[PDB]
Amino acid sequence: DEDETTALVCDNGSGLVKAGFAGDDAPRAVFPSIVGRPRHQGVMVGMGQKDSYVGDEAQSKRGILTLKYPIEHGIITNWDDMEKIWHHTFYNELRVAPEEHPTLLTEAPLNPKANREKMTQIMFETFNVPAMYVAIQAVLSLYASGRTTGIVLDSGDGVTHNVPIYEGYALPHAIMRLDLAGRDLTDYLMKILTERGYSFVTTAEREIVRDIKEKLCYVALDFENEMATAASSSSLEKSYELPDGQVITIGNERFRCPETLFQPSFIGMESAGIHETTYNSIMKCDIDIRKDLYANNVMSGGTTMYPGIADRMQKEITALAPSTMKIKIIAPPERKYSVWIGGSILASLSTFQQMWITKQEYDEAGPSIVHRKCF
């Protein structure tokens, strides 16, 4: 299927795995990060004895399979799910073995050392891979953006990373990760819908309402004013049609769901909102480059697909920062895949072909030394 000896770019982002060959502009195999395990034991004869579903095979059946998240906040919980999702991506979709081409994986900023050593060991010992490389997502996203300056805000599913890069220079001391993202928003919407009257307590419905949020939920331009005008609703409340057919009616809750990002007090945490944390990060940077960080801020992550985030960011930053300079916020189209796109354009360089880590040096050095070599 592939006639070019190039690394397979597999972005294992929290919530959605995006795998594809280098050189492509979009991932071909896109599936959620979920593992379905048979809950009961059947006396039936003939069905697949497979004890571990994955991807679309699990999405197609969520009532029988108990759903487990292979990644939580960033820390890898179960490694069997890791081996399952890579083995599946290798021998069920791409139809190619890892013994013929490299593999450029993308990991989140500020992750545990155990996670890195574990994935590297599974990719070297178990699977025969000629060479591995771990890369931070923020750099590849800035590559795909086509710039060298700005602060990347990557909001995945269970973690949110703010990474400032000015003139290409990474700042490992200022990268601050906060576990507020799509899962805590799904939980907030679920508890407020339970407050509305429709109560559910199973994961399949949780994924359904997550999809409903992805499709409908947006960000408000003025929270309190929308609350007041929605008190007497007319066009502000919408009636959604569940894929099963049950008629759901959702009004203001939509534009109050992502608001939890701006007010973490809703989930009883002393952490500051994403905008205030980004602002504090900007103060932690130097003054000289602060204006450039204001003018080149970039966004990444699937959570940014909601309509109305750019305007909300502009008003909040204008209210926090002075209103004398110019603070333009740029969001490139299809930003979610941009990271992966970067991977593709990063795997075609010959120099990058010279910066890989082969098996033998890793085996003698050991995983810890490999951690030192990368950084």
Partner: peptide
Amino acid sequence: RPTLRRVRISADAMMQALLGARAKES
């Protein structure tokens, strides 16, 4: 920064899937 479009599906596979036996020269 440029790229080659990937929705440009390969003609051989596309020609087989659209025609069947009629695709012989392409």
